[PDB]
Design a protein around this nucleic acid. Structure first.
Lengths: 52, 107, 64
RNA sequence: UAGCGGGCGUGGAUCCCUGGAUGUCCGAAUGGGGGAACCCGGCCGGCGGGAACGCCGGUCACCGCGCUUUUUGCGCGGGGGGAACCUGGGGAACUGAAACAUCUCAGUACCCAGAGGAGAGGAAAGAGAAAUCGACUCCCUGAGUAGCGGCGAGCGAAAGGGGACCAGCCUAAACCGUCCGGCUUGUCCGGGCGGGGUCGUGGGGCCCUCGGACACCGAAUCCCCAGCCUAGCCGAAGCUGUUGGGAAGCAGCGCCAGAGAGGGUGAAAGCCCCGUAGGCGAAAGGUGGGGGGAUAGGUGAGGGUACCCGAGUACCCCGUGGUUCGUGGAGCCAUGGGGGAAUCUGGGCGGACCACCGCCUAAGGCUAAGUACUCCGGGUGACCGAUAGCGCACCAGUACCGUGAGGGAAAGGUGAAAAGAACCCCGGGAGGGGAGUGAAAUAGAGCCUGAAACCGUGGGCUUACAAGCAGUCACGGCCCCGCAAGGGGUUGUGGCGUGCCUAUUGAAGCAUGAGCCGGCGACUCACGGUCGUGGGCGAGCUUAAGCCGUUGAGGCGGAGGCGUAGGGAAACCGAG
RNA sequence: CGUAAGCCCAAGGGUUCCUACGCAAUGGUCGUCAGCGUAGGGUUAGGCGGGACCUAAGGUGAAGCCGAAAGGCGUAGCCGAA
């Protein structure tokens, strides 16, 4: 049951297409800065959300 | 016991409202009730004219206290926050991208 | 917590694979002598029904 | 918490942290007494002129263990507390059985004793049926099964399987010696010590032969240290305008982030404050097997001897308890009276009893952990909001009540700030009335927000020839908004009409409960059932405890359950 | 009234006494007054009472004797009166 849930959860998200699977990241180190810039590079403005 | 806040014993500005954006004296701190007195809260207190400590119409006041966190530090700049540093011989605590705090005693 | 399941209940009666409580005919331990073999032969088994529903509630946990 | 007031500190104080000193009289109370917190004495040092009287210091209780010249002292320990939890010796009754004895509640409540961060338990004279097991305890499981039972109410096991932690040891005996005691001198009767020895395909002893070592193993014990808590320290970013008593809010332009948890700041902020994540810190104290050194200690193979292996014992009877076993065909476990043995051809046991076949070594004592509890320190909450929540937020184990045991409350909010009202006025004061304090005094001092009954000041309508559950229908007048036409409040008349609840065969009842208002106050939950339903899978379906993880994150875990065949009381057969 | 309703003693209550100031509450009304609030003040001992004196029923309680426990009885000794 709940496993379907897991699957079905992402499935819906995938039914929409909001999931990115980058091998690694450009903001490698620990800084809010570089992740912000990368967030420009992904277009994740400032009105979205990250089960990340 | 870890009763360390902010305001100390120099001379500084007002950021409250009654007399916000003003400045006053040494600041005579009192106490753990989070009260500080530059020159800000001035009032006019009654006190019965009883011939002893009061003339034929005592009705005078001067320095009335006011809460601590309602004031702020100013350096040769504008009014920016503080920051500590060890001199390896004492304890300095300047100002946001500025020097000096309350250690003009030789600190 | 946990039902007690009645011992007597199982001890004298059975619910067949149908939710049908079936077992014993009553009345033979003092009968006899003037007893026709007709009824001794009919003292074989019985059937029971109706309140036997409540009797199905009795046994519970193991069924049986 | 001030106040008459007087000191105090960067020659670093209050302050918190550790260590010591200091602690008068009670309290196990301890010199003794005693109506606890008081009284009185001996005995060495001292104090005052100090023998008269006084004080101060030291020291004087019994209990137990081991010494010591039994004499006298020293020696280590004992007494009391504790919220719950724990071991043991005592132990009910209501109530359940719809009544009551057996049975039940229940070996629960309480009484006591004792041990501690634990207890108790704990090295099988066991288990159970497989030639299978391998210390004790806790959770899940088996299982509400096996049974116990006025075969009623109901009571309720162990083996096995999964996890949890994981530890195994030492004496008495035979052999041998050292001191002491006595003595029917004797190859001598006991006490202490000394090595010796500890087992179940049997271990130990003695002689003897294989060969016995520098070794092999390593503590529960003492030390070393990392670590852990008792103070702490660091800590990233803001400014103008603007309404407003008050800006943090709204406008403009940014900044910070491994930190946008929260509190506070006169409103509602990551950047004003305390913080945050992140990262450091203890001279002293405690704590510490987390990691280390060592000590006490523990490791063989064969032949015969027949020395030893826990004594009022095992076993038998009688009278019992415990186990699920209420006496049952009734064992095993422990024990009250009596009867009364063996050392391995002794033996206890696998549920009467026996043949047999297996299992285990009793009658001596110690052992961490896994579990439990919550006074206490922290965190956290689809927890409470001052009739709720601890009985109490507040000056509560306090007032008060009671002989005593005991019962046991009521009471929280001015304001951002005390700025808490100087002056005058009436007034004996009490309290008001201008002024003045603040955004607000509609915040005036048991003062936030003040609802309901509740008393009352004024105004609108109607009431002094009337018979009534107090209203409703209509007409009408009187008083006020409305442009009109319509609305509101009141009541002269007349059409009409046996309050509410509960409780009934039936109430308006002369049945029943309510003076009025306000707050509180009554169909829950956990487990097991049975049915219906919204679902996933579906000839299958699902895991429990627990391992790992997470800070509001899931996964892993198939042990176990229900399902596939039922029939018979059973062996046992089988869609029969 | 005056075998009290006056006056001593004693147990009891725990500062109500005296003095000054004072009325908002305590007096079944008042109240300028008080056993009311408030502050200063007052209780002196070798012979009175009582202990560093005695025993009474009783208590206590080394020893003793006994009880599942807590405990029960209890000699000497100690506590005990107005």
């Amino acid at each position: 049951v709940r496993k379907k849930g897991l699957a079905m959860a992402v499935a819906d998200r995938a039914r929409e297409g909001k999931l990115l699977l980058v091998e690694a990241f450009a903001g490698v180190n620990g800084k809010t800065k570089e992740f912000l810039a990368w967030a420009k590079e992904a277009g994740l403005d400032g009105s979205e959300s990250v089960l990340l | 016991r870890v009763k360390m806040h902010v305001k100390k014993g120099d001379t500084v500005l007002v950021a409250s409202g009654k007399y916000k954006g003003r400045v006053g004296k040494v600041k005579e701190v009192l106490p753990k009730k989070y009260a500080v007195i530059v020159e800000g809260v001035n009032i006019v207190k009654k006190a019965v004219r009883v011939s002893p400590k009061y003339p034929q119409g005592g009705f005078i006041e001067k320095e009335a206290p006011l809460h601590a966190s309602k004031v702020r530090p100013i350096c040769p700049a504008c009014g920016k926050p503080t920051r500590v540093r060890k001199k390896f011989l004492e304890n300095g605590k300047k100002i946001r991208v500025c020097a000096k705090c309350g250690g003009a005693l030789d600190t | 917590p946990k039902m007690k399941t009645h011992k007597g209940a199982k001890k004298r009666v059975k619910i067949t694979a149908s939710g049908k409580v079936v077992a014993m005919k009553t009345g033979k331990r003092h009968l006899n002598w003037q007893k026709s073999g007709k009824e001794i032969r009919q003292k074989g088994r019985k059937f029971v029904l109706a309140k036997p529903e409540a009797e199905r509630i009795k046994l519970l946990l193991p069924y049986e």
